[PDB]
Copies of this chain bind each other. A is one copy, B any other.
Amino acid sequence: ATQRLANFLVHSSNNFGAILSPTNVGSNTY
């Protein structure tokens, strides 16, 4: 059992409210 993972960015959330408008953006390139 082997895994090779190239460069990355990791995040996580939960969010709740009366009004939600989180902005999440990313434009990564190979």
Q: Which residues of A contact B (CB under 8 A)?
A: 1-30
Contact = CB atoms under 8 A, between A and B. Distances in A.
Given A21-B20, A28-B28, A10 B14 contact: yes
A14 B17 contact: no
A21 B22 contact: yes
A30 B12 CA distance: 22
A13 B10 contact: no
Given A16-B16, A18-B18, A23-B22, A30 B5 contact: no
B19 A6 contact: no
B14 A28 contact: no
6 contacts: A2-B4, A9-B26, A15-B16, A15-B20, A23-B23, A28-B28
